[model samples]
Structures are given as structure tokens and as C-alpha cells.
Target chain A: MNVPDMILYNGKITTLDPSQPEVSAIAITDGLITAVGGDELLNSATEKTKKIDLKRKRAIPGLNDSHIHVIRGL
Target chain B: MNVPDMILYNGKITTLDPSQPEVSAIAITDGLITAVGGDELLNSATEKTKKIDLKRKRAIPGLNDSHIHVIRGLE
Candidate 1:
């Protein structure tokens, strides 16, 4: 079974989800976000899982656009 | 003179600028990114400027697309 490799908790994560715009915790598996929620996500941690406390810091999604069109001349 | 209101230093900030794709520091004034460069940006800070040390953590631009076209039907 695939499990999370790391978990970040106690953060002010702006998920951009309209239903739940914010979350305090997130789980990562192989550099991909697997889960997002409150501190309850800590339960999914394993002995090898690395945990990081965000200390109420803000977290936002990375804006690395793979497809973009730069309109230099209109 | 419009000095920076805050400065974030010692971070792995991906600026997405091809000329200078990465920077270690950034200055903010009125919630706007006024400058992007290395630790030298700290020199632009005033006594009232709030400084934040990123401790070499990764910092990327926020992805909040305001103009997104959701394609529901493409037949």
C-alpha cells in the first residue's frame, strides 16, 4: 500500500478550494500532495514518515506554469 | 521615497523570470513585490520594515488563477 512519506501540520494552508478554502495539515507522498485536512492527518504517519510543523505560517500552491502565452505585442 | 514595508530573505524563491529564474530575497511594499534579488535586498529595508527569514525554505508564487476557462464539454 502506498503511504505518505511526509506530513506538514499546524499551517495556514490556502488550498483554494471553495468548499474548504483553508486547511491546517497536508500529507505528501513522493512529492505529491496526497491529503489535506486538519491535524487529524497526523494519524496517517508511519515510523519513516517525516513530519514538519508549519508554526501557523502561510502555505500556498506553487505557480509554475508549464503552458503560458506571453502576449508581448497586441 | 517608497521604501519596502517588508523583506523576506534567505529563501529559495523561484521568480519564474528567465533572466533571473531564482532569487534568495524579495521586498514587499504595500503588499506588492517591489524587488527580487539576493540578500543585498536587505539593505533597502528601513527600521519600520518587517523582516522575515525564510531559513532557506522554498517559496513560490501563489497559483490563484482568476482567468480560468473550465472546459466541461469538448466533443
Candidate 2:
């Protein structure tokens, strides 16, 4: 398994996954999310892993759709 | 009139204004858009005005809505 380069914890993260809709921590590697779970995921961190505490904040995934055309008239 | 703190030019800027739908330049001051026009607006720049050339690129305003709520459910 690839070790995470960064981990963010202590936040309510909405993952959009049907099986695991919410998690308190997430691991990231190569600018992509590798794992999501509770605080237990923090144990897998290495000395090089950058850790960030969210202080119980809410985190939502970004909706970046380049093909969705939005037309507005004023 | 307040002198602009920044100016962006040489690009297609969509202003969303009915009278002036598009402009080639825009001036900003105190984080707010103070003026919008063509390269002529560049003449109003001072030493402090930060000028940026968009190189004929497209610039659109950001839509930031804090009240919009979207809910989705997957079964």
C-alpha cells in the first residue's frame, strides 16, 4: 500500500460514497485522496506525512464540472 | 473618483451588465470593481496600480452564493 503524503483529520468530511458517506479523516497522496476513515487513519502516518487538524469543521468535495454549461441572462 | 488600485487589460471580460455586456479592461480598488472599459482605462493607472495583461484570454465573474443548498441521495 502506498503511504499517504498528507492527512487531514478532526473534520466532518462528506465523501459522496454510498458505503461511507462521511468520515473524520482522509489521506492524500500525489494530490489524490487515497483513504478515508476516522481518527484511526492517523496511525498510518509516517514522519514525512503532513498532518492537519480541521478543528471539527465541515468539509465538502468540490464540484468541478467543466462540461456543465450554465447560461444566465440579466 | 477613486484611482484604481489594479487594472486588467487586453482580454475579453464579461461584465454581466445589460448596457455593456463585454469589456477589454477592468479597474479594481479596495477589492471592488471601480471601472470597466477598453485599454484607454490603462491611462488612468498610477504607480501603485498593479496592471495585468490577460493576453486575449477570457475573464468571467465569480458566482458566490452562500444561501444555495444542494442535497443529493444515492440508493
Candidate 3:
């Protein structure tokens, strides 16, 4: 892919994405998922990307109740 | 109704439970909810409750924002 979703490989990445399942790194560009790929691939985004080292960290999308009050932020 | 859910009826309870949503006092007996009703009803729980007047603070089923992490108290 052109870009990847926020990802951290070598470390465990519980990707919420069912398609690629496990994730090593995920790239978020323009506040959106630009790519999903291996750690090396995701590390490339580090050139100008915000990186978070989630060591022993689990990744899961937070529930948003958009129907009622606004739910923003992860 | 016969509630088995933690409830707080009057103090702006943002119950995570989808049913009987807002509550004032959530009755927890033996580590589980036993009743859910209005503030007047919840007052009964105050027989020995250490109440906090939130004023504007919100309430919800606390998740892992547990003691695992510590912060300075406002006092």
C-alpha cells in the first residue's frame, strides 16, 4: 500500500483490521488510515509521521456513540 | 422495577447499561447491582454511604482507569 496504518511490529499489534489481521505498523495520514503493512513498511512513515511505541500495548478502537452525545478521540 | 443493575437516579448517572439509563444511586450488593431507581429511592442506600457532590463531575462504570496509575489528589 502507499501508506500504512499506525503499526508497531516485533512488538504485538492487535490490529482491529480483520483483512490484514495482525499488524506490525499502521500509518495514519490526514487523520485517516493511509496504509497497513509490515513493521519495516510502516517505519518508512517515520520520515514525517507521529509515532507511538506501544510496547506490550494492545490496540483497539474505542466505542463511539455518535447517535447521542459526540464521541471523539481514541 | 426489580433492578439487578448499579443505579444512581438523581446525580446525573451516565450508566453504561443501555436499559434504565440514567440513575442517581447504583445499589451494589455483594459486588453486583441489586436495584436501580430515583434519587428518593437511592436515598435509602445513603443509610451509610459516603456521598460526593459532583456539581459538574460525571459518573460512569469505571474502567481500568484503576489504581494501576496514580495521580496527585486535588487536596
Candidate 4:
């Protein structure tokens, strides 16, 4: 079963999934990515989830800019 | 032709691709996103690229925050 709402641990998760393209911990449920790699997703942490501990900072995967777009012609 | 390295014009590009969710201008190469939409990508501007004018402020897509890991355990 999957029980996670948020859980990012330790830091360093440069993903693109090329046979585990680097990961430390990650578990989200509704926002997609139901599990990454390593740290066993902190054993699928519970307690209503919601965790983030990226003290090492280096988790990539997020870049969307379809050209700002018609803000009513701002 | 494609030639860009950086160019974040205007603002507000909250895209999820809902048939062009939002756009104002974005074109970067070698770092991904070769083009976006609107303002004709500033005519695919060039000149050694590198232009950012997010005046309207609001260009999303980039979030990763793990609750501060071990930096020698910050007090």
C-alpha cells in the first residue's frame, strides 16, 4: 500500500530515472512521485507524513516555462 | 534556427501544459527549454544571450525543499 503525502529526506535527488539516477529519499502521494530511492523512503514515514530535510540541497526536476503567457496583456 | 542560453522575459509562466497554461517568454538552450511561447520568444533573441526581466514577476516550476539535512546539524 502507499501512504505518503510528503517526505523528502537527506537531500540530493537528481532524478530522470536512469536506473536510479541518484536519490536519497522521496515520497509524495497526491502530488505524484510515490517513492524515489534509498533510505527506504524513511520506511514510508507516517504520522500524517509531511517531511522535508534537504540540508545538502541538490534535488533537480522542475522546469516549466511555456512562455509566461497572456496575463490579460499585462 | 535555435540560439539561446538565457532569456526570461516579462513574467508569469505557470505551465502544466493545459493547452498553453501560461507564458510570457522563455528560451534557454544547453540547459533545456529551447523555447516556450508568446512574444515570439523575443524573435529568438541572441547576442550572447542572457537576459532576464521578470518585471511582472511569476515564473514558476522549480521546487524541491527537503527539511534541511545534516549541515553539521545547524543549531
Tell me the tens digit of each residue's lDDT in model 3 across A1-74.
34433333333445566886776555555455555566665546645554655453444433333222211110
Clash pairs for candidate 1: none
- Rank all candidate structures by their TM-score, best first, as comma-separated numbers: 2, 1, 3, 4
Stretches off by above 4 angstroms in model 2 are A1-74, B62-75
- Residue B55 displacement in candidate 1 (angstroms): 28
Share of native interface contacts recovered by each model: 0.00, 0.00, 0.00, 0.06
Task: Provide chain B's TM-score, model 1.
Answer: 0.78
Looking at model 3, residue B5 earns an lDDT score of 26
Candidate 2 clash pair list: none
Q: Please provide, for model 4 over B1-75, each residue's C-alpha lDDT reduced to its tens digit, 9 standing for 90 to 100.
A: 678877787777767788998887777776677778766677778888777777777775444235323222111
For residues A29-60, could you state the per-residue lDDT of candidate 1 as single tens digits? 86688888998898888899988887776665
Candidate 2: tens digits of C-alpha lDDT, residues A1-74:
67888888887888789999988888888778888999988888989998888677665544434422111110
What is the per-residue lDDT of model 3 for residues B17-68, given as tens digits with 9 covering 90 to 100? 8886776554554446565555555555534543343343344543232212
Better of 3 and 4 by TM-score: 3
Fraction of real interface contacts that model 2 preserves: 0.00
Error of 3 at A8 (Å): 5.4
Residue B60 in model 2: lDDT: 53
Full ranking by lDDT: 2, 1, 4, 3
Model 3 DockQ class: incorrect
CAPRI grade, predicted model 4: incorrect
